[PDB]
């Protein structure tokens, strides 16, 4: 059977996910002196992890139930620490930077992954990879900088990128040495992340503040629920795509989805962007695609 349904499903789910994230994190709550801002990134990530874990459990218990998970629990916990940290830092960065900036920054995983591989794994890559990474760096420099300095948002984005690179390294290691399945990956990572986040929010006292804030603006509850549902559906479709087409197709689909998400964020939410900055993003995405093509 022809299977373009993977592309359509992933694209729609993650496009709506990006729109919802823009609406939530950078939304306007209240007017005048009563105006507030969304500072509860931990709770958002906690809800997302809970929904992802539920969906992964459903998928495992219905689909491909004959597998046995050989991964050690401590490996799952260690990877989940970095995964949760990356997601929380990326979500919190939106408190300072525009959403297109956050998407573009978080789309540069290859740079940190290659740096970790070279410095820690002492791996080697073909000349194409270095040239592709060169294009990404040039595009980011052209976008993130202008002739006319780094604040908290850029530092948060850098930390999130580093944690994403660490998470990728750990996932690759344990997939190679334990044959970890994607569904088990999702389920265990999200379970550990939700446990840690629940502990953190409960002992930080942020849960009560979030509850009061939601009471003030009840509309946010529906947005958060839809955000979690879209994330989970996109995760399931990503799993199905990798099963039916491998990781290369998934990477290409995610890259094009990210580009369209940036375009939609600029068009709809009236985010200002100079024509020179457009060259930066197009160069970054071209480099990402070429890197995907040339391994």
């Amino acid at each position, epitope marked *: 059977l022809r299977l373009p349904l993977c592309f359509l499903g992933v694209f729609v789910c993650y496009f709506y996910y990006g729109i919802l994230q823009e609406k939530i994190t950078r939304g306007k709550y209240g007017e005048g002196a009563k105006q507030e801002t969304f500072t509860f990134a931990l709770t958002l990530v906690f809800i997302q992890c809970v929904i992802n874990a539920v969906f992964a459990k459903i998928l495992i218990q219905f689909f491909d139930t004959a597998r046995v998970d050989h991964t050690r629990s401590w490996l799952y916990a260690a990877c989940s620490i970095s995964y949760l940290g990356a997601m929380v830092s990326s979500n919190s960065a939106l408190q300072f930077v525009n959403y297109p900036t956050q998407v573009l920054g978080k789309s540069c995983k290859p740079i940190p992954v290659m740096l970790l591989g070279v410095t820690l794994l002492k791996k080697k890559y073909p000349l194409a990879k270095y040239l592709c990474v060169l294009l990404i760096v040039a595009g980011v420099a052209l976008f993130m900088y202008k002739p006319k300095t780094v604040g908290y948002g850029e530092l948060l984005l850098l930390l999130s990128l580093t944690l994403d690179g660490l998470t990728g390294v750990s996932q690759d290691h344990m997939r190679a040495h*334990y044959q970890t399945g994607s569904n088990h990956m999702m389920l265990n990572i999200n379970l550990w992340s939700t446990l840690l986040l629940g502990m953190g929010i409960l002992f930080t006292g942020e849960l009560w503040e979030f509850l009061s804030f939601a009471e003030r603006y009840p509309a946010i509850i529906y947005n958060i629920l839809l955000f979690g549902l879209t994330s989970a559906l996109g995760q399931s479709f990503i799993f199905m795509t990798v099963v039916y087409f491998g990781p290369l197709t998934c990477s290409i689909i995610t890259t094009t989805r990210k580009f369209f998400t940036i375009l939609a964020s600029v068009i709809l939410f009236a985010n200002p962007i100079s024509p020179m900055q457009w060259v930066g993003t197009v160069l970054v995405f071209l480099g990402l695609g070429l890197d995907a093509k040339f391994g």
Partner: single-chain antibody
Amino acid sequence: DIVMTQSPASLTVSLGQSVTISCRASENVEYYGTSLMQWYQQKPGQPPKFLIYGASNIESGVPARFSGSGSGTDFSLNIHPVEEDDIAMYFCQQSRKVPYTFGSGTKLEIKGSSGEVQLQESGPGLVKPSQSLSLTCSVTGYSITSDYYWNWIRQFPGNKLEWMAYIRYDGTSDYNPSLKNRISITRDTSKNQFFLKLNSVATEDTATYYCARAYYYDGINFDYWGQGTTLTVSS
């Protein structure tokens, strides 16, 4: 299921020569850059000795003489200097799919001729066809609820190894699909034993049954083996 073929059935070698043993698989056994292959050595009358996990990595304590290679569907084991110590049968087994399979085995011969575990099998020796049989493996020096996989393996006459089932320390168990309808594996943590039950045994079940401990890393590795128990089914 995957079928492993070893081309040289028997090799005649002189001491100090370099010998390469090939092993070909019916399907690709790579997974995210890792070749899920293992190599074992079995002296006559002894349980197999675990040598290599993955295509290349060498188990700690094995001499530097042994060295694996190959990728995809074709693999080979190389012993550059060969001494009288390492003249034995060599088996290659994949771990890509749930039914773990072993190669037919290659025989070498001289031309011109707290971590320690004690596995112990027990059970009836002579049985009649269609009877119900139960094999007990007693573990001492380690707790079966602590870690590692506890498997049951049998070797038919002709040295054809066959993995049967295992029960993990969690209690999760996996079975050979060809035998899932005939056998059941259980454990008794109080006495530190795990049993295997065979119902309606046939003459084809005559073999030597081993209970072996294993750990998963680049595949399942049966590092520790019991001495094995001989089961004979005769009308």
